[PDB]
Write a structure and sequence with these properties.
monomer; 78 residues; mainly beta; three-stranded antiparallel β-sheet; two-stranded antiparallel ribbon; 7 strands; 0% helix; 38% strand; elongated; von Willebrand factor
């Protein structure tokens, strides 16, 4: 019947993205892969790591702004 034709992902920033097979999502975050099995189904692999503990107080009040980490989604300061 109906089968998977792609990987419907959601970025941490609030964005539902459509990846086809062998497609990936280029964003500074936990890398999103979309692959297909030998049966034709699509798998959404999230390449995830551990982000460094962040002091949001050590930012902002100290005169900084909070950015996004490349390679994983977490809080960081300029």
């Amino acid at each position: 019947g109906s089968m998977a034709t792609a990987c419907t992902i959601q970025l941490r920033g609030g964005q539902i993205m459509t990846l086809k097979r062998d497609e990936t999502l280029q964003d500074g975050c936990d890398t999103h892969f979309c692959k297909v099995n030998e049966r034709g189904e699509y798998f959404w692999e999230k390449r995830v790591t551990g982000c460094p503990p962040f002091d949001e107080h050590k930012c902002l009040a100290e005169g900084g702004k909070i950015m996004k980490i490349p390679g994983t989604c977490c809080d960081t300061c300029e």
